[PDB]
Amino acid sequence: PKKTSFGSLKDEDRIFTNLYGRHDWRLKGAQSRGDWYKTKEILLKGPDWILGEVKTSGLRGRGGAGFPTGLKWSFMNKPSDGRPKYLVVNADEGEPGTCKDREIIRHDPHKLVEGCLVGGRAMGARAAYIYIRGEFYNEASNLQVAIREAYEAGLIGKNACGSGYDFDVFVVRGAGAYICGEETALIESIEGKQGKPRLKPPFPADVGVFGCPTTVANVETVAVSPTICRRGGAWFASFGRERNSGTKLFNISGHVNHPCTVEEEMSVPLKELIEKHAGGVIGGWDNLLAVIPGGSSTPLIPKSVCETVLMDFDALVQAQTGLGTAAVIVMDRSTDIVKAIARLIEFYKHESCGQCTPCREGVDWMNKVMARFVKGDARPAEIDSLWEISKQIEGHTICALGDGAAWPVQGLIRHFRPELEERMQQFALQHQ
Amino acid sequence: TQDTQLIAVDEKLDITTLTGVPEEHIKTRKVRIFVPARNNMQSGVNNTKKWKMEFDTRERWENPLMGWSSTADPLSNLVLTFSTKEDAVAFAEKNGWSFDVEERKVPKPKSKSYGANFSWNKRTRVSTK
Amino acid sequence: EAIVKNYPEGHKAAAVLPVLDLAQRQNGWLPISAMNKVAEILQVPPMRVYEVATFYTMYNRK
Numbered sequence: 099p100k101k102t103s104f105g106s107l108k109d110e111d112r113i114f115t116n117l118y119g120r121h122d123w124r125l126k127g128a129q130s131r132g133d134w135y136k137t138k139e140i141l142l143k144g145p146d147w148i149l150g151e152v153k154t155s156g157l158r159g160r161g162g163a164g165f166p167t168g169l170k171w172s173f174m175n176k177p178s179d180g181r182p183k184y185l186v187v188n189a190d191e192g193e194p195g196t197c198k199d200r201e202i203i204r205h206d207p208h209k210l211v212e213g214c215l216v217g218g219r220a221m222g223a224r225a226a227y228i229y230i231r232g233e234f235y236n237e238a239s240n241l242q243v244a245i246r247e248a249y250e251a252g253l254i255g256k257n258a259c260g261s262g263y264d265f266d267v268f269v270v271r272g273a274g275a276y277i278c279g280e281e282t283a284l285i286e287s288i289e290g291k292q293g294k295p296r297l298k299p300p301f302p303a304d305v306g307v308f309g310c311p312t313t314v315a316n317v318e319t320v321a322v323s324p325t326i327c328r329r330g331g332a333w334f335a336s337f338g339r340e341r342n343s344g345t346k347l348f349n350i351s352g353h354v355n356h357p358c359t360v361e362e363e364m365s366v367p368l369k370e371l372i373e374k375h376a377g378g379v380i381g382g383w384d385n386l387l388a389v390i391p392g393g394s395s396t397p398l399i400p401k402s403v404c405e406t407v408l409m410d411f412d413a414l415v416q417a418q419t420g421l422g423t424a425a426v427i428v429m430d431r432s433t434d435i436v437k438a439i440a441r442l443i444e445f446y447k448h449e450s451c452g453q454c455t456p457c458r459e460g461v462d463w464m465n466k467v468m469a470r471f472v473k474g475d476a477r478p479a480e481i482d483s484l485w486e487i488s489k490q491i492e493g494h495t496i497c498a499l500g501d502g503a504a505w506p507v508q509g510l511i512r513h514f515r516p517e518l519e520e521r522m523q524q525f526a527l528q529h530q
Numbered sequence: 531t532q533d534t535q536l537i538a539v540d541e542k543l544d545i546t547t548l549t550g551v552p553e554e555h556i557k558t559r560k561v562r563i564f565v566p567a568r569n570n571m572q573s574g575v576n577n578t579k580k581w582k583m584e585f586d587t588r589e590r591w592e593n594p595l596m597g598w599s600s601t602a603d604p605l606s607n608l609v610l611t612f613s614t615k616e617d618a619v620a621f622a623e624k625n626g627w628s629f630d631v632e633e634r635k636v637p638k639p640k641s642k643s644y645g646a647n648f649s650w651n652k653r654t655r656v657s658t659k
Numbered sequence: 660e661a662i663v664k665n666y667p668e669g670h671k672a673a674a675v676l677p678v679l680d681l682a683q684r685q686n687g688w689l690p691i692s693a694m695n696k697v698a699e700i701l702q703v704p705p706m707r708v709y710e711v712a713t714f715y716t717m718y719n720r721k
């Protein structure tokens with residue numbers, strides 16, 4: 099029936115077999131693992147079949163989105179109007195804590211390119227636009243020698259795997275901006291213009307890069323696709339829970355003994371995750387003061403909720419936060435949470451593309467007022483003003499960077515108002 | 531139903547002599563009605579939703595003292611509002627001023643779509659946002 | 660040329676990111692003359708190059 103507990107994912111069941119670079123990341127090791135198996139049959143089975151199994155597996159957005167891959171990829175099943183349908187894969191990973199895409203792409207790029215081939219066959223896409231964050235130079239260099247090897251083997255290109263589907267991959271650099279992780283900002287960046295997100299509609303589905311029908315995806319999202327297609331949706335549906343199913347490549351960092359990134363089955367309580375893999379938070383479980391879940395965009399969670407809540411989108415929503423990209427960052431007692439959120443929102447201010455008014459102005463306003471808070475120069479009233487400003491930012495931005503910068507402030511206020519109050523009281527007392 | 535000894539009076543009102551306007555101000559002056567075009571410096575619209583009447587501008591000389599803007603015609607800074615142009619023209623004729631008519635220019639509704647900012651082949655694709 | 664052929668024709672200014680980065684790869688710091696040269700190479704207005712040069716990270720203008 100229902101799996102009573104989740105955790106200790108089977109080693110052979112881990113999708114990223116070379117996550118730690120223990121295997122040949124080129125074609126030979128990839129085929130030894132099982133990459134590029136039964137591709138011919140996968141393309142022959144058809145986009146309808148691939149879309150059926152992607153629904154059966156039931157992948158919520160692995161790139162911190164949450165939207166099911168089923169309907170998102172079904173948006174590219176309408177007959178072609180003549181414009182060249184494309185597939186796009188996002189690999190920005192500028193999010194504080196995001197390290198899984200870089201690791202997989204420098205260790206298992208062949209699985210990624212096989213996800214692009216199979217996915218694009220499902221998508222009706224002419225080729226893939228695999229966009230790599232410009233800081234990851236050697237990672238892109240590795241993925242593209244892998245791509246060249248695949249082209250030599252004939253797996254990707256004209257008549258891919260002897261199927262007639264003329265899919266291709268284009269390796270795209272990016273001159274560096276976290277806003278480029280946003281799907282429409284990604285469209286704009288790869289279009290040679292600024293990395294400013296566009297307003298939807300027109301959705302990325304009908305109108306994408308160069309106006310052609312496209313669809314974005316995360317590196318992990320498409321990378322897990324070929325393995326689950328070969329195995330079937332049952333493998334992914336078995337692990338994890340309902341809705342939030344399968345596996346997610348968790349990243350662990352912060353004040354832990356072993357700040358590692360590991361693959362583990364889905365919907366696992368944090369209590370096991372930090373202790374068994376990361377060697378526990380430095381100073382024991384008692385020393386743990388707070389934990390931010392996947393992505394700094396998701397509000398931080400006090401230790402009173404992390405030990406019980408599982409790592410699944412719905413449960414983190416119940417935990418007044420989000421699952422994000424499984425970038426669990428832990429802060430111990432010695433950490434100054436106020437200054438940590440200070441540096442975090444300073445990063446957000448540095449990353450704002452400035453298009454829409456709410457982000458461009460409110461994030462800077464938050465930076466200044468909250469730095470004053472960190473120092474302690476404030477009256478107890480300004481906490482409510484900061485909360486209201488966080489509400490103002492939310493929902494009025496073209497892209498979700500505004501929401502992702504407003505949420506940490508909301509979490510900080512809600513979970514540590516008295517710490518702020520005592521900080522500012524000490525500031526009032528020290529000066530006379 | 532409203533018996534007050536009613537009488538058919540076909541010719542239009544001649545309240546001119548009643549208004550007390552001097553002869554040359556009622557004869558020489560020419561008044562035009564129009565919808566005032568919005569200030570292009572502004573995007574606000576609710577100033578071109580009425581029919582205003584104004585009179586021909588007259589001599590504006592500078593007084594010897596400070597070079598002020600002394601004038602002679604009293605009906606210079608006089609503008610009258612009206613809901614519809616029919617009321618304005620009726621007022622103009624019944625008062626007796628020679629009137630000029632300009633039709634209410636309104637913006638043509640143009641098809642606008644954000645999807646035009648991007649294209650696959652159309653020239654309308656933008657180059658910056 | 661390799662960067663240009665990667666992208667569909669008609670929309671060629673989209674390649675303005677690597678080529679200008681390529682300029683870095685041969686010069687590091689990018690003079691205004693480098694931006695103008697990239698603009699004339701890609702047949703794109705010069706300020707459309709200036710915008711992407713001044714909006715993204717790296718791309719050291721000094």
Ligand SMILES: Cc1cc2nc3c(=O)[nH]c(=O)nc-3n(C[C@H](O)[C@H](O)[C@H](O)COP(=O)(O)O)c2cc1C
Pocket residue numbers: 158159160161162163164165188189190191192193276277278279280281282314315316317319497498499502
């Ligand atoms: C500011 C911002 C940054 C983002 N950065 C990333 C990113 O680095 N990687 C990513 O996969 N998605 C990122 N996203 C989410 C994308 O907009 C998009 O929803 C996502 O790539 C879809 O992933 P999926 O196909 O796995 O559902 C970002 C969104 C925003 C608003």
Ligand code: SF4
Pocket residue numbers: 277294295449450451452453454455456457458495496497498499500
């Ligand atoms: S929130 Fe608005 S201003 Fe900020 S990066 Fe997104 S689109 Fe640009």
